[PDB]
Design a protein around this ligand. Structure first.
Ligand code: NAG
Ligand code: NAG
Ligand code: NAG
Lengths: 224, 224, 221
């Protein structure tokens, strides 16, 4: 029996365009009347639970509570009082969380690197790395789209934020995309979109194809 | 009684990151008791109508009722009703506005044209046109960014959307950025950003400089 | 009421050139005069422990049981037991620990982008390690045979490969100045992994690596 308070990441709120606070109560006994109400410091939130998780392998139940809350309330700093009520707990427990404040804002520097020539020579799989560095407060959402069409989330993996060596305040993040050689050889202008607080547009785009390496001012070829 | 309910346009919701809805009364007594109330389907109370407009010299009544509302509920299509009653007319006037439904969403196609050679020859100024076409609905926000920071609102002018001739539902929009010729010679990489509903991130980016638009002038062939 | 020990990882093995044992006791309340001993699956003697701490208020006995053991004992798979005969429980408790598919890692070095170099405040060289199993790699950076300081370069934790769940990838960067890049430097990235037959691989990139080194085409105003 434990109660968790989960602040939604900017990765979560940007994906669905909604700040969805979520409270997990884990390892509760499988009893009846599983109800999760909602309050705040004012007391006007209303929503119930949806699709409570089944019994975990350690032989106990669990419940999840999620609600829709506006973006401006999330930016205001109000402590949202997520309350969970159950019969096993003699007293219902409520959780109050809010955004951290006072953190500096540093604009991300999204630089896109083409796959290495040695990797291209092997002709099995080519990897394109999106470098997102020099951004705070180190909460980013990086996704890949092809010709304006988003790709499957399984195709790409985004690394967790890590501290920058030179800059202590700024933290970087990484994401790689695996592509076939024939797709890269033809060139579909793969682009990287990065979402962050510090960006004035809050979204930035950088693209690369096979013809980026050529300076496009001269066309020199070697034929035997 | 005449009340003008101005819906929050996409430019308004995107510039301030907070949707602002205003219903403004028009052409009544210069100053008397008035009650403005935003009403949903549930009839719940709303934020107070701050900054009521002062009486105009031409004896035309005007009251600006602004409030902060849920961003997601506005896009959900549920209708917002401004209830205005006045001492002059006992019957209240109900004005209801919402985001229109039954409208197709078409992804904007952003084409960014370099300045003409004839204009660059006179060297008095350079105009860069940001062409956005095939976007629905009519609302759109266009602003200009130079090397990461936005331009002044006076510097750039965005034309009103007009119906596209080929596609009746789709529309097109224009925005010019007149700059001095010597700035274009430096190739400082002007960037055009646009905001619209249909884009996957709701915003997309295009860039132009002196290097872009230059073909391969030199096919230097080294063949043995 | 359990015992936990830190397994020797190939990075830690390669740093000290030997397998070292670290048994940080967890989930056991700190009492006076506790008994902790190192034994194998069969239980012969060990060397004396070193650098143990006092009682820990956080209910986790944060004193390390240090012992240096041969490499063949670790890679043979026979278990190691951190036997902790605690005061509260007369029955001794031990934790069996050992190594748990091997794929040769492929190391590819990506030169810094021109956008990074044009701005000139810094240059980042990325070391992409892919297709290694298990997740035990130590990415280190070499410059003309001189090992760079650990603070310059940082390596992310290995993540499962999207193409193959068995495969893992690790990615590391080196933060240098633009002058250090446009001036001739080797900047070798060396990667050590168990699955490598040589146990060590490295790649080198230069400013002229991108150039074909057949035609030096230049633009002059
Ligand atoms: C540029 O050079 C490549 C090298 O083979 C060649 O395939 C391509 O056709 C050239 N571009 C043009 C426009 O001819
Ligand atoms: C450039 O030269 C190459 C020589 O191999 C030729 O194949 C190509 O068609 C040329 N491109 C143009 C645009 O003339
Ligand atoms: C051509 O070679 C010279 C060697 O002195 C070098 O400095 C120069 O950078 C080379 N050209 C290019 C385009 O790299």
């Amino acid at each position: 029996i434990r109660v968790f308070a989960i602040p939604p990441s900017f990765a979560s709120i940007f994906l669905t365009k909604s700040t969805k606070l979520t409270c997990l109560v884990t390892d509760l006994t499988t009893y009846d009347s599983v109800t999760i109400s909602w309050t705040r410091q004012n007391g006007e939130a209303v929503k119930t639970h949806t699709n409570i998780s089944e019994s975990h392998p350690n032989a106990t139940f669990s419940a999840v509570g999620e609600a829709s809350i506006c973006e401006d309330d999330w930016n205001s700093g109000e402590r949202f009082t997520c309350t969970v009520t159950h019969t096993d707990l003699p007293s219902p427990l409520k959780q109050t969380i809010s955004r951290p404040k006072g953190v500096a804002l540093h604009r991300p520097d999204v630089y896109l690197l083409p796959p290495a020539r040695e990797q291209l020579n092997l002709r099995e799989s080519a990897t394109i790395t999106c470098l997102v560095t020099g951004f705070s407060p180190a909460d980013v959402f990086v996704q890949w789209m092809q010709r304006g069409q988003p790709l499957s989330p399984e195709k790409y993996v985004t690394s967790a934020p890590m501290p920058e060596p030179q800059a202590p305040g700024r933290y970087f993040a990484h994401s790689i995309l695996t592509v076939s050689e024939e797709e890269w050889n033809t060139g579909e202008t793969y682009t990287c979109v990065v979402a962050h607080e510090a960006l004035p547009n809050r979204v930035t785009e950088r693209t690369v194809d096979k013809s980026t390496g050529k300076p496009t001012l001269y066309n020199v070829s070697l034929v035997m």
